[PDB]
Structure 1
Amino acid sequence: IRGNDVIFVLKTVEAFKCDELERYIDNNPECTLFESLRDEEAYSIVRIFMDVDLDACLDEIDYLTAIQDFIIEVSNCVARFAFTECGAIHENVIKSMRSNFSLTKSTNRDKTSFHIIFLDTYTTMDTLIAMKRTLLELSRSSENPLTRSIDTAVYRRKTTLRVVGTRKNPNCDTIHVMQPPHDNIEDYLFTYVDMNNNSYYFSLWEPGFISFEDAIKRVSKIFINSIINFNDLDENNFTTVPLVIDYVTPCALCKKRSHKHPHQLSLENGAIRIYKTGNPHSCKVKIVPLDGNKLFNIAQRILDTNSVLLTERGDHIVWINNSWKFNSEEPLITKLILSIRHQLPKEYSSELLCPRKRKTVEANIRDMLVDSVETDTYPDKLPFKNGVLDLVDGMFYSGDDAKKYTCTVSTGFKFDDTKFVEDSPEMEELMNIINDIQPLTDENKKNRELYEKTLSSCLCGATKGCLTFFFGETATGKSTTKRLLKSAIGDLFVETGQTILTDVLDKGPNPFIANMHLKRSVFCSELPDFACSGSKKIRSDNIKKLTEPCVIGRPCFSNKINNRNHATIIIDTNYKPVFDRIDNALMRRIAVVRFRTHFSQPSGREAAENNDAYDKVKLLDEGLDGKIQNNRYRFAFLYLLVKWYKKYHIPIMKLYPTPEEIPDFAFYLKIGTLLVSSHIPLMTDLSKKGYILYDNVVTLPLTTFQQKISKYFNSRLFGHDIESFINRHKKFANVSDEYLQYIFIEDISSP
């Protein structure tokens, strides 16, 4: 659509532009033109507009407060309707609606009418048609005289709206005068679509009220004083007889001792309006409802601010003090009900001070929350205690903006821009520490890049399909890297023991199984070396099961077993891992990060001078570990992590395994590179080489195979591995021995 600059009008027809309409209006002040839609189907996208009419006069203060509350209520209700039905964003709609709006007026001083248009919000006419019932409920479920007077009509096909500055009728001289700051004729058109940057768009007496006597009693209680002309009002004289009151005490509505004329009660929109006659500003207007609870309307107003949603599992997440809290032990809805009373009208705030009413208006909220939402869906954002830091752009959001993202976890500490710097001595000290841990030589280049990549994945809410191994001799200070990462990433990071590396992953109630829920990094240290006999091999089942994007595990006294998996798993030790089970999936799901830095004191430095444990040796310092424990380089290291993530995270970043540094998998690699599955039309070459083919399957004797492979590989090194491989690929039968099928790649190449 890209907006429309043509305004179609009806004289009781034309298609004029902004300048054309302005010139025509200036030429003819008395012309009556109604702005409508030239074609309903073509340009159904229009602005959001409302028309309000209340036949009474109000002063400046009352009008100001009433219009403020009217904007608040209408914007919240429309944003809630957009969120539930049109799939929009609540915060965006609220911001667009409250940012800028055009408000007209009426030249008549005996009544208050206007047409209000929200400039930046645009939606299809079908959406405004569907909003009919919701807006009618809002109109009939409020106390504000402006909100109660909303005309739900004008939401029909091919509707028309009276243009500003033109008389509605030739006989009626009253016209609507524009108000600051718009002052332009294009700012009061409900079809003038002007989509731009700061904008948003979305799309898909009746007896039945109450007994008369109770209404009369309510009116009398409002008047406080007794009615002089009592026992005279009935069904017929409801809006005819004046209400004469004795001025025993000053009027509750006006606070004055007396007035020139009595009051009068009228019926409108299922409510009773009490107003004085003669001078209009002598007494205010009193509104009396005729249906609905008072505790249900409060629940609706608290609900349609989108602050008490429920999760996809069944937990009600509330928004208190700029953070999405939630607890399943002491539910927080009553805290929210108490703390939100300031954003509610005067009559709705005194109710939320009795604890027996903040349980009624809370049962209502729980009964109105049907269907769920999804939490922590955007993985490129880091939730801090006072907001959300964006990673792709680096901009920080605080306050209601962070509400847009259902961040159910947090790092635990606030975000400070002063410490968040680039050129600081702490940054240089951290860079020196990292260089000491990771020398930047060309030999280390690839390993250092893998280090930076696997260390920067901690700022990702997505799931990763690899498990990097920190392999390095002692005194390499991997604990320093662990401490720096913990200080940078807050309480999201978790350190776990080897309990998951040996036992069954799910099995029974495992605390680390549930703790992997939404934690962004899991670290294991000092692995139980399986080189010595007795220690269990690294459970291949657990490693395979930890890679999936889901976690299945239920702790003691619980039933939930589904957890979202975001943690990057890192294992650090000085011993090569040993896994009893081996398959191609394992060979494609293991990465190794090598450490070649020795941090040793001078006393043993000579002992480390010729040591083969590390490719370099340098003096250590006991005064650094405490510094890392004191969150010294926290924000500089966080900046480094952000830079690494930016330089590494392409539109799709993946953890690539490195199956070359693991000594155990080298045997399988050598076997595969020298022997694979056995090619029918190559019998002559096999016969020349000595091998024979029988029953369409080339075979050799088991003793012959052992003799052939004796020289190719060291039998004493991996005799158990060779026996296990033979058992796995065993075939048996045939001739007078077992059957072994393979191709000697080294012999296959040689003719």
Structure 2
Amino acid sequence: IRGNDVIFVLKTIGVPSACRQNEDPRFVEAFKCDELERYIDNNPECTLFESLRDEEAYSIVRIFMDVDLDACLDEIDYLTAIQDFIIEVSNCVARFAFTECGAIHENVIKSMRSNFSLTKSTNRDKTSFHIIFLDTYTTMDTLIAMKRTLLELSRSSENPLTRSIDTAVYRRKTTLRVVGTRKNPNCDTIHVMQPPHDNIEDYLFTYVDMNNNSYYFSLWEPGFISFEDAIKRVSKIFINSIINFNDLDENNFTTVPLVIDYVTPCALCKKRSHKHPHQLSLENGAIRIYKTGNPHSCKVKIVPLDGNKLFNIAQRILDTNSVLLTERGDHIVWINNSWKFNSEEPLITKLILSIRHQLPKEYSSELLCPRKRKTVEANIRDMLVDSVETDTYPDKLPFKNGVLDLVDGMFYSGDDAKKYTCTVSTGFKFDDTKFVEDSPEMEELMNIINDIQPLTDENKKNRELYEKTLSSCLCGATKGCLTFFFGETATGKSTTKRLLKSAIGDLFVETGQTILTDVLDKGPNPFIANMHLKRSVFCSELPDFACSGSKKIRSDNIKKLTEPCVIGRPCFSNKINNRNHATIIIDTNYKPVFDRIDNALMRRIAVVRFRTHFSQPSGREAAENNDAYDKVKLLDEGLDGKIQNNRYRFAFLYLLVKWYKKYHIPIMKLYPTPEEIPDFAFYLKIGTLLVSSSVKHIPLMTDLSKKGYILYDNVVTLPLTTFQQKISKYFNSRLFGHDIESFINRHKKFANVSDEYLQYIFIEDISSP
């Protein structure tokens, strides 16, 4: 809504609703930056509060909090406290935004932690301030919802600043004090600004200046603890007996000073003795222990009265969005700049141990006992209810140390890569130095590629399709066609398989022929179960069926593999569905033959040609005489070893990325080539030469009758003997009699005359006069 730049101000607290509606200038005002500054300057002792003029259109506000701690802290304690407070509050708000407002935890963290205005009250007995997050915007109903979780965080933390969060001022018509202005006419203390923020729009929670680095999102109690245990905790922290004992009741808790015999130095500040004795106060369900008189002689102490420490630790670990539950009931953790999941060995305890550095020291020491880490893991599993979607951005290449942007070539490492929840990684680290164009390895790889597929004019299209198929493996989406690497021996299909394996790493799996032969549903099929979020799978050495004795590759499997999802379950699992981002590549020396052929199969089969031979010098002319190759090149033997050494990995990766960039016109697809595999040629020629019967061709019987055709009940039918006599001049029986009878029975209708009749006419006959 482009925000607002007018500041609405009330003067006196408790102004009437009638006065607010009438907008009487005696109390109601509206200014801009310069007008506000001039008003504050000219009128020094005027009260100034900020509110919302409209809750129906300008509900957009910033993220703000109020903290007031009734104690004095020195500089170092103040700095560590504010650091911990910022981290905890930003994590809590980001987790709430992610889990309720549908926002993104990482941009929320970035916007809240980039900059903030932090004032300081001129009063010296206490530490109070307002904090404004400039670049985070949301509606007021969002704060309405945030109230509960912010109160829970306030109640469940030891930090004085976080514990002293004012959970009010999150209501309707909420009014915030204006900086530099007294709250009461009879008081003098005010709030003053702190560097590097010096202007006045930096401290107003309604002023909106949305820019690039911005983000917006939208949608003694008897139950605390036994009093004896509370006093026991106080004494146990004191580490010394108390002179005034058995006289402090529940009623005189906040009145009677406490006196300590200084046998051991006061553990709060290690000082040998204190002039004035120590006293207790009850704030927000915690006992604050302080010393009267000197504000810096003793460090203030916090004793909680409720909650569970190992539950607070688990909540703090959970609200960093580093453990998540997927739609398949598996827990993914963010360790070492990657998303990892392992059903065999859960990694939650590893995450708990590793994440202790991003937690306050009080919670840090508890995460060293394996028993307590197991307790925290048990808490986390119970809190993780509901699931989240993963791997939804098909433009990113996930490396073990980050994410490479395919549309740009920019590498994101660390938290920047955390947004893209890519749960499968190549397994190795990206390297920008080795991801360069000019390199001797690059020239060697270009030589190899041009050797395997020449750039000749005849080969041009096949080489381009080679590039297309190799590039589309990088796509994280689902493609609608398979690729067959058909070629003769010693031609480089296994070499390019090894090249892709080295280039893609763990985003690559090799499976057997069971996928192409057996039923995919069946029972336990870990081969199908291994294609989860893969991008390149390989089936090698398809057992071709030139001789009878083996079940042919079934069409059902190849139709099912094209689907965006695949139905299949592993051993001892309940999930039945896995996403199909993988490109299915099968290596064979022979033409595959499918059991059932129909129309749809001409939209799924793309094959790649290999016509280059690498041979020993002895078989030079022996290979040259063969027509299986169009060129013979000498064979290099250490090339396999150096490829196994992953020497060409980054060169081939750069080449693939450039191919993807070139081929990636907005959205990309794959197209079959149903003219190379020979078993489809039968049906192609039959379709281009034979068509079914017709009813709209009824006023065209003259030429058919002149040729010799007969008419019956408006359906063209002819005997089988003359069908064979007519077809004997196009197809030979000794060639494909099995296929001939196959389609004959497929289209048999029987009836008519005294023999079977079929609904078929010849395209050549109707084409001829």
TM-score normalised by the chain length of structure 1: 0.97
CA displacement 1:307-331 (0-9 Å, x = unmatched): 1212212222222232222222332
Unpaired segments ≥5 residues, structure 2: 13-27
SS for the counterpart of 1:115 is strand
- Classify 1:581/1:30 alpha carbon distance in 2 versus 1 (closer, same or farther; 3 Å): same
1:230 Cα deviation after fit: 2.2
The superposition leaves residues 608-641 of structure 1 with CA deviations (integer Å, 9 ceiling, x where unpaired) of 4453222333333223222222212110110111
CA offset at residue 601 of structure 1?
4.1
Is residue 77 of structure 2 the alignment partner of residue 77 of structure 1? no
Deviates more, 1:669-678 or 1:680-689: 680-689
Displacement after TM superposition at 1:600 (Å): 3.4
- Deviation at residue 358 of structure 1 after TM alignment: 2.0
CA distance in 1, matches of 2:768, 2:489: 45
Cα pair 1:524 1:572 within 8 Å, conserved: yes
- Aligned to 1:554, the other structure's residue is in SS state coil
1:246 and 1:140 mapped to 2: Cα distance?
32
% identical equivalent positions? 100
Offset of 1:558 from its aligned partner? 4.2
Rounded Cα–Cα distance in structure 2 between residues aligned with 1:618 and 1:252 = 83
Structure 1 residue 559: deviation in Å? 4.0
3-state SS of paired residue (2:733):
coil
1:22 aligns with 2:40: no
Pairwise CA distance, 1:577:
1.5
Task: Please give the per-residue CA displacement for 1:504-545, whole angstroms capped at 9, x wherever unaligned.
Answer: 333343331212222211222332232234444332222223
**Alignment match of 1:271 (pick from 286, 293, 300):** 286
CA contact (8 A) 1:550 1:564 kept: yes
* Cα separation, partners in 2 of 1:387 and 1:218, compared to 1, 3 Å: same
Q: Secondary structure at the match of 1:340?
A: helix
Cα deviation per residue 1:180-208 (whole Å; 9 max; x = unaligned)?
A: 11111111110111211112111003333
**1:538–1:578 Cα contact (<8 Å) kept:** yes
CA spacing shift, 1:216–1:158, aligned 2, 3 Å: same
1:109 is aligned to 124
Which one of 188, 192, 196 corresponds to residue 211 of structure 2?
Answer: 196
Task: Report deviation, 1:683.
Answer: 2.2
Point out the more displaced range, 327-336 or 302-311. 327-336
Of the structure 1 ranges 375-384 and 263-272, higher mean CA displacement relative to structure 2 is found in: 375-384
Shift of 1:151: 0.3
How far off is 1:555 after superposition?
4.1
CA 382–574 in structure 1, closer or farther in 2 if over 3 Å, else same:
same
CA-to-aligned-CA distance 1:42-86 (integer Å, 9 cap, x gap): 111111000100111110011111111111110111011011101
Q: What's the secondary structure of 2:734's corresponding residue?
A: coil
CA distance in 2, matches of 1:495, 1:149: 58
CA contact 1:493–1:520 (8 Å) conserved in 2: yes
Q: Does 1:7 align with 2:14?
A: no
Q: Which moves more between the two structures, 289-298 or 97-106? A: 289-298
- Shift in alpha-carbon separation, 1:729–1:484, aligned structure 2, 3 A: same
Q: CA shift at 1:557, angstroms?
A: 4.3
Contact 1:29/1:165, CA 8 A, preserved across alignment? no
Which residue of structure 2 aligns with residue 732 of structure 1?
A: 750
CA 1:364–1:497: 2 relative to 1, 3 Å: closer
Q: Distance in 1 between the 2:242 and 2:488 partners?
A: 96
Gaps of 5+ in 1: none
CA contact (8 A) 1:318 1:325 kept: yes
Structure 1 residues 246, 533: closer, same or farther in 2, change over 3 A? closer
Structure 1, 424-433 or 624-633: larger mean CA deviation: 624-633
What is the aligned partner in structure 2 of residue 636 from structure 1?
A: 651
Match of 2:728 among 689, 710, 718: 710
2:415 to 383, 400, 407: 400
Distance change in 2, residues 1:459/1:341 (3 Å): same
What's the CA shift for 1:16? 1.0
- Distance in 1 (CA, whole Å) between partners of 2:516 and 2:229 is 73
CA displacement at 1:285 relative to structure 2 = 0.9
* 1:251 positional shift: 1.5
For 2:261, what is the secondary structure of its paired residue? coil
Deviation of 1:406 (Å): 2.4
**Residue 549 (structure 1) shift:** 2.3
Deviation of 1:602 (Å): 4.2
Q: Which residue of 1 aligns with 2:453?
A: 438
Is the CA contact (8 Å cut-off) linking 1:506 and 1:513 kept in structure 2? no
Provide closer, same or farther for how the CA distance between residues 355 and 474 of structure 1 changes in structure 2, counting only shifts above 3 A.
closer
Distance verdict in 2 for CA 1:57–1:368, change over 3 Å: same
* Further displaced range: 268-277 or 502-511: 502-511
Distance in 2, Cα, partners of 1:352 & 1:334: 9
- Name the SS of the counterpart of 1:569 in structure 2: strand
RMSD over aligned Cα, in angstroms? 1.8
Structure 1 residues 664 and 330: alpha-carbon distance in aligned structure 2, compared to 1, 3 A threshold: closer
CA spacing shift, 1:238–1:485, aligned 2, 3 Å:
same
TM-aligned CA distance change 1:449 to 1:139, over 3 Å: same
Q: 1:247/1:650 Cα in 2 relative to 1: closer, same or farther (>3 Å)?
A: same
Deviation at residue 40 of structure 1 after TM alignment: 1.4
Query: Take 1:620 and 1:218, find their aligned partners in 2: how far apart are those partners?
Result: 81
For residues 662 and 22 of structure 1, the distance between their equivalents in structure 2, rounded to whole angstroms, comes to: 81
Closer/same/farther in 2, CA of residues 657 and 493 from structure 1, 3 Å limit: same
Helix, strand or coil at the partner of 2:95: helix
Secondary structure of the corresponding residue to residue 138 of structure 2: strand
Using a 3 Å threshold, how does the CA distance of structure 1 residues 687 and 69 change in structure 2: closer, same or farther?
same
2:514, 2:321 → 1: CA distance? Answer: 42
Moved more, 722-731 or 28-37: 28-37
After superposition, the C-alpha distances for 1:393-431 in whole angstroms (9 at most, x for unaligned) are: 211122233222222222121111111111111111111
Aligned length: 751
**Quick one: distance in 1 between partners of 2:760 and 2:378?**
72
The alpha carbon displacement at 1:684 in A equals 2.2
SS of residue matched to 2:367: helix
8 Å contact from structure 1 (residues 4, 192) kept in 2 = yes
Residues 75-107 of structure 1, C-alpha deviations (whole Å, 9 max, x = no match): 111011011101111121111111111100011
Q: Aligned-pair distance for 1:706?
A: 1.1
Identify the range of structure 1 (668-677 vs 642-651) with the bigger mean alpha-carbon deviation: 642-651
Alpha-carbon distance in 1 for matches of 2:311, 2:572: 36
Matches of 2:521 and 2:463, distance apart in 1: 34
Q: Give the distance between the partners of 2:403 and 2:438, measured in 1 at CA.
A: 24
Question: Structure 1 residues 472 and 332 mapped into 2: Cα distance closer, same or farther (>3 Å)?
Answer: closer
CA 1:165/1:534 → structure 2, altered by over 3 Å: closer, same or farther? same
Question: Mean alpha-carbon deviation: is it higher for 530-539 or for 254-263?
Answer: 530-539
Separation (CA, whole Å) in 2 of partners of 1:293 and 1:505: 49
Looking at structure 1, the residues matched to 571 and 170 of structure 2 have their Cα atoms a distance apart, in angstroms, of 56
Equivalents in 1 of 2:256, 2:642: separation in Å?
85
Q: CA deviation at 1:245?
A: 2.0
How many angstroms apart in 2 are the aligned matches of 1:616 and 1:334? 58
After superposition, the Cα gap between the structure-2 partners of 1:166 and 1:333, relative to the gap in structure 1 and judged at 3 Å, is same
The answer to whether the Cα contact below 8 Å between 1:386 and 1:398 also exists between their aligned partners in 2 is: yes
In terms of mean alpha carbon deviation, does 493-502 or 81-90 score higher? 493-502
Is 1:386–1:399's contact at 8 Å kept on the other side of the alignment? yes
Q: Secondary structure at the match of 1:309?
A: strand
Question: Which of 682, 685, 691 is the matching residue for 1:670?
Answer: 685
Change (3 A) 1:739 1:287: same
- Residue of structure 2 in register with 1:170 after alignment: 185
Q: Distance in 1 between matches of 2:709 and 2:581?
A: 53
- The Cα shift of 1:686 comes to 2.0
Match of 1:159 in 2: 174
Q: Aligned-pair distance for 1:269?
A: 1.2
Instruction: Look up the match of 2:333.
Output: 318
Aligned counterparts of 1:535 and 1:314: Cα–Cα separation in 2: 39
Deviates more, 1:322-331 or 1:444-453: 322-331
Aligned residue for 1:50, secondary structure, equals strand
Cα drift, residue 548 of structure 1: 2.1
Which residues of 2 match residues 190-339 of structure 1 at below 5 A?
190-339=205-354
Q: Secondary structure at the match of 2:191?
A: coil
Q: Deviations over 1:292-314 (max 9, x none)?
A: 22222112111111112122122
> By how many angstroms is 1:223 displaced?
2.4
Shift in CA distance, 330/523, structure 1 to aligned 2, threshold 3 Å: closer
Distance 2:525 2:289 in 1: 67
Deviations 1:362-381 (A, max 9, x none): 22212111111122222222
CA pair 393-688 structure 1, distance change in 2 beyond 3 A: same
Instruction: Classify 1:697/1:374 alpha carbon distance in 2 versus 1 (closer, same or farther; 3 Å).
Output: same
478-487 or 346-355, larger mean C-alpha shift: 346-355
